[PDB]
């Protein structure tokens, strides 16, 4: 694809696990496209408290928010969940790419549309749903992302319990204790690996 | 300009044309009167005229 | 030959902004239009055209069961670069006898909009005449033969014209033999 003609002038960089891609406050000077790997988009308040905005997986762009306007700082931290083979395009050259071909932009805007939908959903969950419904929607959504195994009748997830903390953005004791409340209600079966019926 | 405007655009004896027929418009162009300023009137003229 | 309905760019009575041909001269250019219908006894056509050049019958949305014998039978003309034209033509099936005048004299019905009614100068009945001869039976030589000179367009078998006529007369006069 575009990926290989791209790769020949090497901007593709292979980053180890955790190695921070974006430090927010950097001046926006390059677009990315994750060719391999999973990424954490995340933010911090001044008093050390941190929140994850999204994971970002292969096929996705990092940093697009600065391509449109001059001289902006990067909106979130972007840190590698694992080993990442990552494209880099400079803005003044990627805009030439838009000028050459906007076909990419359709798929790009469809992804953005799904992102807006899920973000408005999250504001709804926050304002209007307590912890229980949030982690139900979690374990439900977890029962649909393509890594889940099947457990003959019902869905299976075993991510032990760290990555969910970073997806839904919560503590882990409360996840456990309400994983148990759902176990009483006969909707999950968890002993670390939670089976979503 | 104001004169040659006024007079070419204000008069008796000038009016819209009989367009229904090339005959009517020529014989309108081949037409003669004994009326107008310095002329006659229907009530004053008689049979001799 | 029946009727036309014109509906186009502007208001729709009926020639608008870059047609030479005012309305009765497009329709009289459709009177001599020759159409043959084969399967059915009834038809409706449509037309849409635009842009400078002669507006003819080849542009007609011919129905598949319709034989247009002249695609060069002129209809109209488009003059302005801005001018464009959309209309509908009711080809034949009629009923009864000649024109629009006597038709609406019959027809109390008033019909919705677009519809521009037309005189019927038709197709396979053009002119006629006849001749009474004296039939020669050997003795009854004063008996009569007839000879009917008939003239049409194509599209009708005359024996069919004649059979239809006799069946018709039989069936009218059912109102006088069976009915009093």
């Amino acid at each position: 694809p575009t990926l290989e003609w791209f790769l020949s002038h090497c901007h593709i960089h292979k980053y180890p696990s955790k190695s921070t891609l974006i430090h927010q406050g950097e001046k926006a000077e390059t677009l990315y496209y994750i060719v391999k790997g999973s990424v954490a988009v995340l933010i911090k308040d001044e008093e050390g408290k941190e929140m994850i905005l999204s994971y970002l997986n292969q096929g996705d762009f990092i940093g697009e928010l600065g391509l449109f306007e001059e001289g902006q700082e990067r909106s979130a931290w972007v840190r590698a969940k694992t080993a990442c083979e990552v494209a880099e395009i400079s803005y003044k050259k990627f805009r030439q790419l838009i000028q050459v071909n906007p076909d990419i932009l359709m798929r790009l805007s469809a992804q953005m549309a799904r992102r807006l939908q899920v973000t408005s959903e999250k504001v709804g969950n926050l304002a209007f749903l307590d912890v229980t419904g949030r982690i139900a929607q979690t374990l439900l959504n977890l029962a649909k992302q393509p890594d889940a195994m099947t457990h003959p009748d019902g869905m299976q997830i075993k991510i032990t319990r760290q990555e969910i903390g970073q997806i839904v953005g919560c503590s882990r004791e409360t996840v456990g204790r309400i994983l148990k409340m759902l176990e009483d209600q006969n909707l999950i079966s968890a002993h670390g690996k939670t089976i979503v019926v | 300009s104001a004169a040659v405007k006024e007079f070419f655009g204000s008069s008796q004896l000038s009016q819209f044309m009989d367009q229904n027929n090339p005959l009517s418009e020529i014989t309108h162009k081949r037409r003669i009167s004994a009326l107008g300023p310095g002329g006659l009137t229907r009530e004053r003229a008689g049979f001799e005229v | 030959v029946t009727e036309v309905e014109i509906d186009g760019v502007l208001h729709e009575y009926s020639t608008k902004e870059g047609v030479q041909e005012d309305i009765l001269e497009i329709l009289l250019n459709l009177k001599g239009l020759a159409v043959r219908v084969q399967g059915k006894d009834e038809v409706i056509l449509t037309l849409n055209k635009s842009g400078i050049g002669p507006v003819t019958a080849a542009d007609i949305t011919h129905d598949g069961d319709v034989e247009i014998v002249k695609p060069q039978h002129v209809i109209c003309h488009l003059t302005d670069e801005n001018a464009s034209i959309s209309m509908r033509i009711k080809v034949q099936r009629g009923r009864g006898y000649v024109p629009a005048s006597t038709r609406i004299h019959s027809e109390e019905d008033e019909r919705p909009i677009g519809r521009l009614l037309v005189d019927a100068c038709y197709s396979p009945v053009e002119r006629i005449a006849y001749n009474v001869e004296a039939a020669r039976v050997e003795q009854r030589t004063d008996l009569d033969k007839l000879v009917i000179e008939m003239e049409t367009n194509g599209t009708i078998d005359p024996e069919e014209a004649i059979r239809r006529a006799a069946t018709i007369l039989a069936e009218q006069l059912e109102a006088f033999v069976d009915l009093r």
């Binding site: - | 819209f16 044309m17 009989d18 367009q19 229904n20 027929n21 090339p22 005959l23 418009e25 020529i26 | 309905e5 509906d7 186009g8 502007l10 208001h11 729709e12 009575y13 009926s14 020639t15 608008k16 902004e17 030479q20 005012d22 309305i23 009765l24 009289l28 003059t79 670069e81 801005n82 959309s86 509908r88 000649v98 024109p99 005048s101 919705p112 909009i113 677009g114 005189d119 100068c121 002119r127 006629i128 005449a129």
Partner: protein, 541 residues
């Protein structure tokens, strides 16, 4: 035309008009009723100019007396035009003679009180031809003026459920399929700001139900007046929801019009832009297949070409510039509300064209004072006919001709009957498609027919196809001149009529068809030349 003339028809059809001229030698580019385009020859074409020698043209128009104006050709392209010829006909002219009326059948009889006193009877068939049916362009208008409450705006918004009978319609709706519209409908929707009125509980409850926002911009739409069967043929103008629909749709209309205007007028020029590269080398297959724009990067050499690379670029500049200009002007002028001038807030214009079939009350006549009012249209089977089965166009009362003493109309009649006598010969020669020799023989036999005719032609001058054009243009009729006091004689018309194989006096037995019989005596038959008038029951009732 008139079959019977006096000779003065031609110079009057001419001197009511004027003439034209030609251009350089060439090949006729575009052909039309009124325009011709010629392309000048390469040797004649100067190198700087393109030399597309083009001509001008003609159109429709109203009269001072609400009648129609136009011009058409009586000619073909690719034929020599002798100077002073008529290249285009008029309202009342054809090939350069006068045309006031039509030529058709006549029989002089009483008939059941239908030609009692000066009235006229007529077959149905003449209006199947519409040949007397005709037109009246009429006019309608809209002054849009300054209103204190605010300018009259062009828009139309409506409460009061359905703004009724629109309630009862089908799904379609008076704008019904294909933008169809009835009599009474709107053409130009203008609204006028409205004052207020006494605030009675009923109507105030009604505009608390519907609630037209404020200032209640009263309706002033320009409509089809009642019963119109005319043609609102065009609109000139002189400078809410559906407000915006109608005006941005007016913009849809207008930009599509004018985007068309663009794309034609510059798709013209893109040929020369391309070609200008192909001069100075050839990108004989390097030019085309790669996308067209990227050709200036193709063949380029020293001094004289970069100037034209930039002339090319200047075209690229000027043209898109002028579109930016026109866009500004046009888009704002559709986007603007009505706010124009003192008293001229604006003026909108309309003209009509009323054409429908002729009917009793219309006044018809000939050329000897021979008037007549209409009293019925006669079915054809209900016309007098002959053993030929061929029925009469019209029936006239001869009650008055002794007391009217217009015997010239009689002579007119005979000399017309004989002329259809020759026209039918040429008709049969057409359907029978005679050989060139016979056409030559008969037609020169036709021209040199009269006693000692002052006027003389040979056809051996012409080729075959010229005689073919000649016979293919004469079929609506050849005329004849009976000069007024140098007119014809009983001997001539009688010799002429029997040359038609007709009766010497054109007196022929006629058959009624209400019973098929014969009448008692034969009747005078022959063709008169008659006149319509503006003195119509239309114009009287």
């Amino acid at each position: 035309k008139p079959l019977v003339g006096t000779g003065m028809e031609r110079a009057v059809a001419v001197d009511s008009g004027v003439t034209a001229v030609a251009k350089r030698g060439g090949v006729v580019q575009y052909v039309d009723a009124s325009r011709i385009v010629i392309k000048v020859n390469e040797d004649e074409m100067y190198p700087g100019e393109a030399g597309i020698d083009i001509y001008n043209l003609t159109k429709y128009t109203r009269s001072n007396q609400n009648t129609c104006i136009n011009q058409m050709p009586c000619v073909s392209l690719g034929e020599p035009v002798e100077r002073g010829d008529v290249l285009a006909d008029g309202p009342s002219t054809d090939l350069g003679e006068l045309a006031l009326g039509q030529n058709m059948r006549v029989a002089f009889m009483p008939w059941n009180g239908y030609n009692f006193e000066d009235s006229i009877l007529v077959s149905e068939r003449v209006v199947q031809e519409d040949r007397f049916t005709t037109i009246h362009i009429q006019e309608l208008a809209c002054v849009s003026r300054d209103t204190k409450l605010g300018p009259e705006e062009i828009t139309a918004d409506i409460p009061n459920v359905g703004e009724a009978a629109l309630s009862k319609l089908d799904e379609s709706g008076i704008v019904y399929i294909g933008a169809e519209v009835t009599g009474g409908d709107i053409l130009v929707g203008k609204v006028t700001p409205k004052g207020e009125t006494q605030l009675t509980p009923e109507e105030k409850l009604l505009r608390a139900i519907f609630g037209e926002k404020a200032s209640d911009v009263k309706d002033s739409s320009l409509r089809v007046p009642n019963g119109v069967s005319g043609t609102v043929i065009d609109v000139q103008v002189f400078t809410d929801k559906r407000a915006l629909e109608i005006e941005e749709m007016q913009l849809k209309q207008a930009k599509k019009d004018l985007s068309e205007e663009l794309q034609i007028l510059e798709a013209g020029l893109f040929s020369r832009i391309r070609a200008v590269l192909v001069a100075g080398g050839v990108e004989a297959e390097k030019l085309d297949k790669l996308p067209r724009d990227r050709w200036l990067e193709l063949g380029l050499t020293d001094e004289e070409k970069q100037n034209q690379l930039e002339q090319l670029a200047e075209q690229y500049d000027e043209l898109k510039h002028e579109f930016e200009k026109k866009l500004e002007a046009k888009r704002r002028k559709i986007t603007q509300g009505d706010d124009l001038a003192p008293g001229v807030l604006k003026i909108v214009k309309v003209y009509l064209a009323v054409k429908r079939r002729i009917q009793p009350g219309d006044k018809m006549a000939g050329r000897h004072g021979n008037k007549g009012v209409i009293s019925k249209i006669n079915p054809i089977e209900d016309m007098p006919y002959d053993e030929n089965g061929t029925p009469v166009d019209i029936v006239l009362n001869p009650l008055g001709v002794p007391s009217r003493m217009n015997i010239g109309q009689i002579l007119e009649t005979h000399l017309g009957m004989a002329a259809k006598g020759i026209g039918d010969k040429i008709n049969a020669m057409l359907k029978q498609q005679q050989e060139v020799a016979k056409l030559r023989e008969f037609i020169q036999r036709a021209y040199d027919l009269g006693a000692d005719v002052r006027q003389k032609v040979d056809l051996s001058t012409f080729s075959d196809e010229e005689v073919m054009r000649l016979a293919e243009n004469l079929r609506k009729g050849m005329p004849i001149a009976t000069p007024v006091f140098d007119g014809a004689k009983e001997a001539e018309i009688k010799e002429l009529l029997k040359l038609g194989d007709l009766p010497t006096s054109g007196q022929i037995r006629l058959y009624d068809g209400r019973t098929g019989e014969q009448f008692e005596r034969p009747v005078t038959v022959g063709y008169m030349y008659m006149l319509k008038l503006n003195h119509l029951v239309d114009d009287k009732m």
